[PDB]
Write a protein that binds this DNA or RNA. Structure first.
Ligand SMILES: C[S@@+](CC[C@H](N)C(=O)[O-])C[C@H]1O[C@@H](n2cnc3c(N)ncnc32)[C@H](O)[C@@H]1O
Lengths: 98, 91, 107, 75, 383, 93, 107, 93, 95, 87
DNA sequence: ATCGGATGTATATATCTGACACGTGCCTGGAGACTAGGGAGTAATCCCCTTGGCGGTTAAAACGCGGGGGAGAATCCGTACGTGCGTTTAAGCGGTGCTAGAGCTGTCTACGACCAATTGAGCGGCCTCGGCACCGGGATTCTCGA
DNA sequence: TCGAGAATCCCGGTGCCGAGGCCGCTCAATTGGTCGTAGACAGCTCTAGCACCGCTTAAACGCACGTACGGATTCTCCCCCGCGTTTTAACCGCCAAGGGGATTACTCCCTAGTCTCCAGGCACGTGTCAGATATATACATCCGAT
């Protein structure tokens, strides 16, 4: 049969790959559109200087990555390797965000 | 047959699905996550939306005080610094 | 009356004059001492030297002669004290330290 | 009988007659609650009651509801 | 298999002679000149249902960016509304069975040839229908789809506002004079909530391009629908939109009531607004970003409001810390019963999310809610 | 107009520490932001210290105390020693 | 002329004059607007009025006519907005609200 | 020396909202510390806002924006309402 | 004899509805003094300062134990264990 | 006993019932035996940080008395603002 | 456990290439040199608040002994998430054009700083009484083992 | 379910000490002047953010296999709760001395201010080589079969 890696091997491979890299893991245009929609709530038309959207993407990716580190720690504390929404909720509750 | 609208502005749709499942998967993988539950994607989309609304609200408030129509990088940096999320490399 | 910069008097690379002007115009106090900008410039120079030393070590570990944001991130987060100082700070294009939880690795 | 509502949400009962004037009501409120006359303003049906006028001028009905406003500081 | 129109959508019951039967029976030839869809920026001609001599050109091509305007969707909507509203039986049945399946299939599959053939066969089948039967049916109509007036107003909008939509972005300030529209769905919802009826008066403070004025005058039959605007670009666009509306309303036989605009002059310190506030039955003020000074000016204007007048707004007219100590006994805001409701999705043109909107009814007496301290709170406390 | 920054001095310190190593524009901007942020932290802490002691001036003592409060551990000790060296050398000439 | 406090002019209980003097002497800026102290005093008075109203409600619910730190703690934490404003704040002698997790309750 | 505080004004607001409720010394000190802390927060935020815009004046606009940034949600709206009402009442005098 | 978990819940109710300091005053004062003896100068520790330290420490430990209890419940346990405290301090950013 | 009474360990002075009460106020039904030493260590670290900051304030003020305002400012620095002792 | 197959990826070398480093004009901020005010250093005094002790009481801590209830380990289910593959989607690159919003420069007029005289708001001290703490006793409500 | 039994709540009375209100007495807020300049408005420049289109192909998405890990069940067992007795030290109350934290008064050196001089660094421009990217290959790692 075709050579197939067991579950969790390629997961570790992507962990090693993306931990040594620095490029943005959220694509630029979808995040820009999300930012513009979130700013569409105000009736004024806003322009979002190109560095500002990039800075928002840096901050959002860093926040989500730290959140997933905390979520992984919570899941590993619960004798599990699969993060679940309960884990994110616990991480944000302990952090003081909820 | 499909209807349409579009008034004076291109009203962007929900556009949080643009933060795709592989994108959240990559973000988790960078965080050291080996396995991701299927409900992580919607929850993380909600968390990202809440965080972005907070940061963009602060940045647009800073822009409002400056009497500007442009959210400069300095506005985002100051909004993030206000939340304790101090960002370097943009000012 | 030759002009000699105060940074030259203090043997500092950083701008004692600009630091004094920033302290005066920063609305930190009604007045600013004469020795205060020298001290603050010295502290800033020392911290910058620390970050650049560790970042250059990281760059040499990667066989690269230009310090990039990734090297600054490695320098900050691999040093406990600097990471504690910059704990609440996000470095753009810095990434994350390579780490994986022990139980996640295969048996 | 009539009722009066105050800004603190307290309902206070008054026993008066249609021929009664606003001034005696004002002193009646004063003696039951201690609020002096000059600080209190009366409102009915979106209309402010005048001291020179009387209850029958405004055509008060039985078991009606008035409103009392206290002059705290003004402008 | 989908339709351009929601055939099962809400049906608005006509409360006045919306379709001018006398005008249609007395006039058989159309002389107006609406902005042709072809002039906006393969062609197909849509034949006017009521007037034989009018035919509108549409650039039917499924290869352009339809983000700004979709002529094929408009043609489908118009043919469906002819099938639904403007055609009596048995003609409605044949028009429904023959064209709509083919037309919808062509639209879904982007079949330009099929779409043009559907348009041509539709025009041929309408031409043989007597005009007498159509005008008789329009006379006997008592309800029509809620989306019909919405799509009609959007057609007028596309003829009028899209060619110069960017001119609406010339507002200079961030917290005043900023332009934002309320979609016709929200307008129908609030007009139903506020019980606009024949003989009522509607004022719109800051009408922008006058969407609310024209929509009220159309789907509520107000005796006079008024709108005041300051911006020059929005004023010129209002003039263009009203002219296009009059032409289109004459095209479809729809009566247009008295619509009045006070353009290029603020409603504050305005004589016409001052004399029209007493007779208003509904007052719509889009105060989403009005500053506190303009809110005070609106309060000053609304002092002369009558009893029963309902005031629609995106933010509360009364400041949420409003009280009654000295300068409020003679004020109107004490008599305002404020009721909050939640905006639905796609209710406003500036965003998809939504929010909240308040209807303030002018009461005969002072509002009883403000007296209770519970109401004044933002939203027990014990261990 | 002129937009001042700590780029030249960061470069000078870099060539002092690592003669053969350059620095990229993004890294230079991050180092500039770091210098500005630490300057703001130390200056704000010194301002708070001056206000608490009812002092209108920021002399070297407030900056030294702010460094002690802000920098953790050996960073504070080394920064304080460097600042003392700088002040002594500056006053000597 | 007869002195009239600016707090009386603004209809504020809080000291607009003291707020202006604190802004000037706090060195928040080189110059301080005339309407700034009125605005800041009004905001402070509003926040104090809200917290005192909720604390007095707590005291009344506890059959006490004197506000203590416990009532302030209950008022602050029971209200989402005030708690979020004072999230990082410790109120002395306040304790913590009654909150037992449902898992801990007996089966 | 005279140790100033917001005690009398906190008491006045207490009697405004709750005429028949007192407040203890510890609660009084907590309220005074709260007023001082929020004053410092809003003043510092307005100072940062003025510095960012290169403006030397703390106007009502700066304090309004600072109050919008600091207070969450409905608290910000009501505080802005109170501040605007107070400024409007004061300027018309 | 009440079963296990009953008097514990009664204590939770007793100490959540009460505000008195849960650490004895003098032992905490002595602890604070030793923690400050690392500096050679003999400090005087104004009694309100010791009280403020006790307030802050008790509030911090109460919040830490709330987080620890949440962590323990997350792990399908009711007994808090040192790994719960370590997780709480790690997630908070204190370690 | 030389010139000043060097205090003994006095971290056991935070007794087991005291840590139990602190946990109970936090809504803890059961406590592991090892929670006590862990809590002692965490409290020691926190007190070390806060008292180091307060003593830094005091020595800057050229005082030998750790005033309550020093503790309040130290806690405010650490994002743990304390109300009731001035500020 | 160990031997091959397939895979990813690491190393290596070659060829770009645009961002980094260095050179130069100059101009705007830094530096030298008075001048004068006042904030800060230093000295003297008061007395508040700290240390230390001491002794008696009494709540709380520590120790010890059941025991049962929750932690942890082992087993088994099944389903839900990981991994490839083929398809579809649209992001990213890469050009062009619009024009309008950020930035800079030039009035000048309102506005806030500063200063002097005035006095009522606000704070330090001292009654003083009533809301809250303590204590005895009775009613209430929950808990547990039958 | 019932009974017995322990916290817990409440009712009343007593006691107390600290919140509230009053009285001076400062001195900081208010009023009334000028006068420097911050910034609001207007005009001009110009460059960057919006918008559009087309093509390549990297990435998203749907589906299918399967396997391993999340959840449930069951068992042991040991450790931590609850209760009782002894012990220990906190606590309160009271005494005392005196360390140094406020406070005031004097002097005077340091720093704001301003004026002039000048050179250090920021904008602009151009060389050129570190790094990225291309391919191509060696080597390490995972996994299936024996
Ligand atoms: C958000 S738009 C609402 C447009 C329209 N009423 C609607 O809902 O579709 C607000 C409009 O009010 C106008 N406006 C704002 N302030 C005004 C004033 N003071 N006098 C007259 N019009 C004003 C502006 O021109 C702007 O177009």
């Amino acid at each position: 049969k075709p050579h197939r890696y067991r579950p969790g091997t390629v997961a570790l491979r992507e962990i090693r790959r993306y931990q040594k890299s620095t490029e943005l893991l959220i694509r630029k245009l979808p995040f820009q559109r999300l930012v513009r929609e979130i700013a569409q709530d105000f009736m004024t038309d806003l322009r979002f200087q190109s560095s500002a959207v990039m800075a928002l993407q840096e901050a959002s990716e860093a926040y989500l990555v730290a959140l997933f580190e905390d979520t992984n720690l919570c899941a590993i504390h619960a004798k599990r390797v699969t993060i679940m929404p309960k884990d994110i909720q616990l991480a944000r509750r302990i952090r003081g965000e909820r | 047959g499909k209807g349409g609208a579009k008034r004076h502005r291109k009203v962007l749709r929900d556009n949080i699905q643009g933060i795709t499942k592989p994108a959240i998967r990559r973000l988790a993988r960078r965080g050291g996550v080996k396995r991701i539950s299927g409900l992580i994607y919607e929850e993380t989309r909600g968390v990202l939306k809440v965080f972005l609304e907070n940061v963009i609200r602060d940045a647009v408030t800073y822009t409002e005080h400056a009497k500007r129509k442009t959210v400069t990088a300095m506005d985002v940096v100051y909004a993030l610094k206000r939340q304790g999320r101090t960002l370097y490399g943009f000012g | 009356a030759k002009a000699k910069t105060r940074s030259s008097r203090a043997g500092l690379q950083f701008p004692v004059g600009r630091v004094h002007r920033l302290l005066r115009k920063g609305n930190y106090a009604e007045r600013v001492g004469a020795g205060a900008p020298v001290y603050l410039a010295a502290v800033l120079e020392y911290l910058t030297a620390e970050i650049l030393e560790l970042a250059g070590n990281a760059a040499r570990d990667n066989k690269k002669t230009r310090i990039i944001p990734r090297h600054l991130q490695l320098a900050v987060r691999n040093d406990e004290e600097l990471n504690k100082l910059l704990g609440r700070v996000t470095i753009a294009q810095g990434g994350v330290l390579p780490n994986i939880q022990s139980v996640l690795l295969p048996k | 009988q009539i009722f009066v509502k105050t800004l603190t949400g307290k309902t206070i009962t008054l026993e008066v007659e249609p021929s009664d004037t606003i001034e005696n009501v004002k002193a009646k409120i004063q003696d039951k609650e201690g609020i002096p006359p000059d600080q209190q303003r009366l409102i009915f049906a979106g209309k402010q009651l005048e001291d020179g006028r009387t209850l029958s001028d405004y055509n008060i009905q039985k078991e009606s509801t008035l409103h009392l406003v206290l002059r705290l500081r003004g402008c | 298999s989908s339709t351009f129109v929601d055939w099962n959508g809400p049906c608005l019951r006509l409360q006045y002679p919306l379709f001018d039967i006398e005008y249609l029976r007395s006039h058989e030839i159309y002389s107006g000149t609406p902005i042709q869809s072809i002039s906006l920026r393969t062609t197909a001609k849509l034949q006017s249902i009521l007037f034989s001599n009018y035919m509108e050109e549409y650039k039917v091509d499924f290869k352009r960016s339809t983000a700004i305007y979709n002529p094929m969707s408009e043609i489908g909507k118009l043919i469906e509304y002819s099938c639904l509203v403007f055609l009596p039986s048995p003609y409605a049945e044949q028009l429904k069975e023959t064209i709509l399946p083919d037309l919808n299939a062509s639209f879904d599959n982007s079949d330009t040839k099929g779409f043009v053939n559907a348009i041509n066969l539709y025009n041929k089948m309408i031409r043989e229908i007597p005009r007498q039967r159509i005008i008789d049916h329009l006379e006997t109509i008592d309800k029509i789809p809620r989306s019909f007036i919405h799509d009609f107003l959007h057609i007028v909008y596309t003829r009028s506002i899209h060619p110069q939509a960017n001119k609406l972005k010339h507002y200079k300030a961030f917290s005043n004079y900023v332009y934002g529209e309320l979609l016709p769905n929200f307008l129908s919802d609030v007009y139903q909530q506020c019980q606009l009826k024949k003989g009522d008066t509607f004022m719109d403070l800051g009408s922008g391009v006058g969407n609310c004025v024209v929509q009220a005058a159309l789907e509520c039959g107000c005796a006079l629908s008024f709108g005041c605007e300051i911006m020059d670009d929005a004023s010129d666009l209002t003039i263009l939109q009203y002219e296009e509306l009059k032409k289109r309303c004459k095209l479809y036989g729809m009566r247009l009531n008295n619509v009045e605009f006070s353009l290029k002059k603020s409603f504050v310190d305005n004589n016409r607004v001052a004399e029209l506030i007493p007779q208003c039955d509904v007052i719509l003020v889009n105060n989403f970003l009005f500053d506190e000074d303009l809110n005070k000016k609106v309060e000053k204007i609304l002092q002369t409001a009558k009893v029963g007048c309902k005031i629609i707004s995106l933010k509360s007219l009364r400041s949420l810390t409003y009280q009654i100590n000295f300068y409020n006994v003679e004020n109107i805001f004490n008599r305002l019963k404020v009721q909050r409701y939640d905006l639905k999705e796609d209710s406003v043109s500036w965003t998809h999310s939504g929010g909240e909107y308040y209807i303030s009814t002018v009461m005969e007496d002072v509002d009883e809610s403000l007296f209770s301290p519970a109401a004044r709170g933002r939203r027990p406390v014990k261990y | 107009t002129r937009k001042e920054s700590y780029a030249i001095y960061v470069y000078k310190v870099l060539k002092q520490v690592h003669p053969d190593t350059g620095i990229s524009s993004k890294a230079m901007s991050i180092m500039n932001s770091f210098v500005n942020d630490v300057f703001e932290r130390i200056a704000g802490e010194a301002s708070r210290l001056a206000h608490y002691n009812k002092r209108s001036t920021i002399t070297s003592r407030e900056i030294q105390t702010a460094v002690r409060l802000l920098l953790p551990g050996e960073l504070a000790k080394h920064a304080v020693s460097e600042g003392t060296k700088a002040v002594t050398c500056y006053t000597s000439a």
